[PDB]
Amino acid sequence: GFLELERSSGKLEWSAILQKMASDLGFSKILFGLLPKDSQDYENAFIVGNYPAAWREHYDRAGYARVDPTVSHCTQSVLPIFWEPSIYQTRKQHEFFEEASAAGLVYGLTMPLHGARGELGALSLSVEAENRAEANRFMESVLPTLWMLKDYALQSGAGLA
Amino acid sequence: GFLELERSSGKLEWSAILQKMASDLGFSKILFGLLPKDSQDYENAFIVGNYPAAWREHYDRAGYARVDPTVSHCTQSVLPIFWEPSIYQTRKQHEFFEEASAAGLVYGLTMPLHGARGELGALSLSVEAENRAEANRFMESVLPTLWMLKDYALQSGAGLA
Numbered sequence: 001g002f003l004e005l006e007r008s009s010g011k012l013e014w015s016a017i018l019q020k021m022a023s024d025l026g027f028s029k030i031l032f033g034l035l036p037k038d039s040q041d042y043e044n045a046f047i048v049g050n051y052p053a054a055w056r057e058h059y060d061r062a063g064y065a066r067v068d069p070t071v072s073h074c075t076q077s078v079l080p081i082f083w084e085p086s087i088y089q090t091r092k093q094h095e096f097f098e099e100a101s102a103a104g105l106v107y108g109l110t111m112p113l114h115g116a117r118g119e120l121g122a123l124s125l126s127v128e129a130e131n132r133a134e135a136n137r138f139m140e141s142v143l144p145t146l147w148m149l150k151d152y153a154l155q156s157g158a159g160l161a
Numbered sequence: 162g163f164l165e166l167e168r169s170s171g172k173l174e175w176s177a178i179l180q181k182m183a184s185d186l187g188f189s190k191i192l193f194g195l196l197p198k199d200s201q202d203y204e205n206a207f208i209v210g211n212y213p214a215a216w217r218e219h220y221d222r223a224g225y226a227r228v229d230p231t232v233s234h235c236t237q238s239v240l241p242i243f244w245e246p247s248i249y250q251t252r253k254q255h256e257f258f259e260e261a262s263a264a265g266l267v268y269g270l271t272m273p274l275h276g277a278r279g280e281l282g283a284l285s286l287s288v289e290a291e292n293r294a295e296a297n298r299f300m301e302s303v304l305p306t307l308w309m310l311k312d313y314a315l316q317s318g319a320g321l322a
């Protein structure tokens with residue numbers, strides 16, 4: 001439910017709930033990340049979820065925030081960007097893709113977060129599918145629910161980053 | 162469809178499409194209003210829809226932007242506020258409610274708009290119901306669709322205000 005999210009007290013409880021709503025919706029890995037107004041400090045964003053630790057580490061250390069095409073997207077758009085070959089346009093972005101894939105992030109989307117007080121962030125979710133046609137079918141069945149979720153997550157989570 | 166919205170050229174065509182999507186979804190009256198970053202100039206907002214002209218006129222002239230509880234809500238929240246007695250807390254807000262009602266705005270909601278470039282706005286939609294239980298039933302059946310709609314409307318409409 002969306003209400004357990006808003007009425008949850010701490011960071012552990014809130015992120016636990018967001019993460020179970022995400023698995024219950026059928027997503028495997030989740031990242032919620034949020035920055036205050038006018039910050040581009042991606043190495044110091046509020047970040048919760050279940051991305052493997054080694055991958056989050058590589059990401060920060062290699063400076064992927066500057067490369068990751070979903071980052072520049074969130075900056076200019078409120079619409080989701082699905083993780084497709086298309087979005088990986090330069091060749092550093094291709095390297096980025098072969099690494100994410102090796103870390104298990106192949107099918108998925110990133111929902112941009114733009115808060116009432118100027119917050120900037122992203123909710124990203126992975127899908128385990130035997131392929132991208134099954135993965136889109138799945139995504140298309142959950143989108144409206146997810147779209148609501150990302151907003152409840154931003155409103156309630158903004159008050160604790 | 163959402164694509165006709167994004168791929169539409171001018172203000173007339175885009176607002177025509179937004180407005181038919183809204184009637185097709187079962188809403189009667191619609192207001193989309195949008196302000197650029199750091200503006201509180203509500204008398205000079207980009208505003209399209211089908212609210213009666215006399216009511217828009219009264220609103221601007223009486224300075225309702227300062228009274229209308231949905232305005233302060235959009236400023237602090239990304240969640241919808243449903244038009245219920247509850248939200249009309251002071252007595253100037255009650256006057257505001259008896260006037261809106263006399264102008265046909267009784268059941269409805271307002272979806273706050275927070276753009277990628279800091280835009281501020283609202284999508285508001287009225288529902289004609291023989292009452293608020295039918296009106297909520299209706300609203301609850303369309304919410305996920307609407308929630309998607311308000312974001313497509315903001316992304317595509319931001320580029321023409």
Ligand SMILES: Cc1cc(Br)cc(CNC(=O)c2ccccc2Cl)c1OC(=O)c1ccc(Cl)cc1Cl
Pocket residue numbers: 031032033034035042043045046047051055056059065068070071074075083100105110120121122124
């Ligand atoms: C900091 C950060 C760390 C990591 Br690990 C991952 C992301 C977002 N990127 C993805 O989730 C992703 C998408 C497709 C393929 C592979 C990946 Cl890794 C991050 O980005 C954010 O949290 C973020 C994104 C946008 C905005 Cl505006 C703000 C933030 Cl804080």
Ligand SMILES: Cc1cc(Br)cc(CNC(=O)c2ccccc2Cl)c1OC(=O)c1ccc(Cl)cc1Cl
Pocket residue numbers: 192193194195196203204206207208212216217220226229231232235236244261266271281282283285
């Ligand atoms: C300028 C403006 C004119 C008018 Br006529 C109406 C609104 C929004 N209010 C409603 O739609 C409403 C809701 C419940 C009951 C009665 C009414 Cl009249 C307006 O507000 C906006 O357009 C607006 C609202 C919030 C934000 Cl942040 C920005 C804007 Cl431009």
